[PDB]
Write a protein that binds this ligand. Structure first.
Ligand SMILES: COc1ccc(C#CCO[C@H]2O[C@H](CO)[C@@H](O)[C@H](O)[C@@H]2O)cc1
Length: 158
């Protein structure tokens, strides 16, 4: 089991960490969602599906910077909604293919009433998403830590 981003940034067998740089909608109103789709950004595969099934969760999703300050959120994992920042580990997604498949995570971030003006700064960390991989075969238990950064400012009109 290993993962790589659309940017080609790899985290090998055994886990690790990687930075992910995303383009965000430039303008988002209070009450509406900024959508951060990681399913086009992060991909993983199973190296031995003949014998092993990999189990993959979002163990923890944390908000940072302008997202923590200016937004409330949910995360969709495999299309189902949970609080973001997370308050528990998600259900597991089974990874049974040697072909890469997306990690099915998207954030839906709504500016709160206090927000206005520049709500997320270009270059800033918006989220850390911890992918946890275990399996049905041995004791492997590894974290693939994804730091998510904004490529551009996000403005909340006033
Ligand atoms: C008994 O003979 C064996 C021969 C090969 C293997 C193996 C293997 C590959 O392991 C990797 O790939 C597995 C499948 O993706 C993961 O579950 C592991 O955590 C790890 O990343 C295990 C047992």
């Amino acid at each position: 089991f290993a993962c790589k981003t659309a940017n080609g940034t790899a985290i090998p067998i055994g886990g690790g960490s990687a930075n992910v740089y995303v383009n965000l909608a430039p303008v988002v109103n209070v009450g509406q969602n900024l959508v951060v789709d990681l399913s086009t950004q992060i991909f993983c595969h199973n190296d031995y599906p003949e014998t092993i099934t990999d189990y993959v969760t979002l163990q923890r999703g944390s908000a940072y910077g302008g997202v923590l300050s200016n937004f409330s959120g949910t995360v969709k994992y495999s299309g189902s909604s949970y609080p973001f920042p997370t308050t528990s580990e998600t259900p597991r997604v089974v990874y049974n293919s040697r072909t890469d498949k997306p990690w099915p995570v998207a954030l839906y971030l709504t500016p709160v009433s206090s927000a206005g003006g520049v709500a997320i700064k270009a270059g800033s960390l918006i989220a850390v998403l911890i992918l946890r991989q275990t399996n049905n075969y041995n004791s492997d238990d590894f974290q693939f830590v994804w730091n998510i950064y904004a490529n551009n400012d996000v403005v909340v009109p006033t």
